[PDB]
Amino acid sequence: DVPVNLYRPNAPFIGKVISNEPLVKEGGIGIVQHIKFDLTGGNLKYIEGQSIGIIPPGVDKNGKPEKLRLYSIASTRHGDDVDDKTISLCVRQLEYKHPESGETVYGVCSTYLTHIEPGSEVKITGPLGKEMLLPDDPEANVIMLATGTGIAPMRTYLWRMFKDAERAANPEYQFKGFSWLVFGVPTTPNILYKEELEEIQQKYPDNFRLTYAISREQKNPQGGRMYIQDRVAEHADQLWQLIKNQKTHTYICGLRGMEEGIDAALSAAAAKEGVTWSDYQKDLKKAGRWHVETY
Numbered sequence: 687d688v689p690v691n692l693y694r695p696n697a698p699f700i701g702k703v704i705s706n707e708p709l710v711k712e713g714g715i716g717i718v719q720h721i722k723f724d725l726t727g728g729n730l731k732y733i734e735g736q737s738i739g740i741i742p743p744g745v746d747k748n749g750k751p752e753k754l755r756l757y758s759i760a761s762t763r764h765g766d767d768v769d770d771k772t773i774s775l776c777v778r779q780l781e782y783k784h785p786e787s788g789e790t791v792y793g794v795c796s797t798y799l800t801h802i803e804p805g806s807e808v809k810i811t812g813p814l815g816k817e818m819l820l821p822d823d824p825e826a827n828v829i830m831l832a833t834g835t836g837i838a839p840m841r842t843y844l845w846r847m848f849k850d851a852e853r854a855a856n857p858e859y860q861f862k863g864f865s866w867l868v869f870g871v872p873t874t875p876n877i878l879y880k881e882e883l884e885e886i887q888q889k890y891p892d893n894f895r896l897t898y899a900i901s902r903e904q905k906n907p908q909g910g911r912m913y914i915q916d917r918v919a920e921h922a923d924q925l926w927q928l929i930k931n932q933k934t935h936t937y938i939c940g941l942r943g944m945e946e947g948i949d950a951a952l953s954a955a956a957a958k959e960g961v962t963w964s965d966y967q968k969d970l971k972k973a974g975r976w977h978v979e980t981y
């Protein structure tokens with residue numbers, strides 16, 4: 687079933703940008719864009735939780751052509767308009783410090799993508815990944831632990847679960863389990879897809895819980911800035927009791943670094959019932975119910 691590598695770097699699909707929209711509001715930190723591509727012309731199909739490659743134009747500092755960068759698909763299999771004609775991405779412009787030898791450094795593929803014009807042609811590969819896939823069971827529980835652009839696989843899950851047009855298009859997937867997003871960003875303007883996320887929770891208060899960790903607006907109990915791991919610690923017992931369900935899947939996605947705090951919190955919960963989390967977790971991985979994509 688799972689489509690993989692319908693296009694490869696040696697002969698990528700040439701898509702066209704339909705749209706490029708700002709996801710970070712005024713007063714937020716950084717630039718994250720929602721970019722939709724036209725898939726007509728070829729046969730790139732994909733499902734939720736997968737990634738695609740984008741090959742940027744240009745050569746590196748060595749004169750060699752730039753390679754593909756991997757990006758979590760931010761749309762469901764059907765695309766944002768539920769026509770099966772497009773695919774979307776959620777791209778943060780990488781930028782950073784003086785210790786890089788220059789000044790402020792801007793990432794090649796991410797600057798290219800966040801500044802790209804509708805009408806522009808992009809080299810696209812994939813889809814890739816069997817690690818962040820959603821169970822076909824409509825009564826599965828789905829815990830989603832996301833920071834920043836790690837919201838992208840979560841968006842594909844939630845849109846498939848809860849969008850009116852998605853439910854109408856997917857007769858076999860009528861989600862009636864429980865899902866819980868814990869989403870961590872620096873500010874409220876940085877809550878990507880905030881409006882749609884909150885409308886899902888208003889529409890399905892019993893099937894979807896939304897929790898934010900906003901570091902510039904909230905403090906954890908020890909006085910530090912609030913991060914996703916603090917929220918997982920706060921709800922460690924609850925999250926552990928859902929994780930004990932044979933049908934619960936947990937997904938972690940975002941830049942690398944949150945996993946160590948998530949594990950310490952869940953470890954302390956499981957220890958209360960004589961269970962060593964790290965061992966339970968290894969069994970969850972083998973079972974295909976512990977999903978991780980950090981980068």
Ligand SMILES: Cc1cc2nc3c(=O)[nH]c(=O)nc-3n(C[C@H](O)[C@H](O)[C@H](O)COP(=O)(O)OP(=O)(O)OC[C@H]3O[C@@H](n4cnc5c(N)ncnc54)[C@H](O)[C@@H]3O)c2cc1C
Binds near residue numbers: 776783793
């Ligand atoms: C499976 C997967 C999925 C991904 N999904 C997404 C996504 O949905 N959205 C998204 O925005 N990104 C995503 N990324 C990351 C994305 O692929 C690119 O790595 C990222 O966009 C930066 O690429 P670039 O071309 O902009 O940067 P480059 O020009 O390749 O710059 C990156 C390099 O500069 C260095 N560097 C980076 N940050 C720092 C820092 N703080 N300090 C010092 N040196 C640094 C490192 O050498 C790094 O290799 C994903 C990565 C993977 C592996």
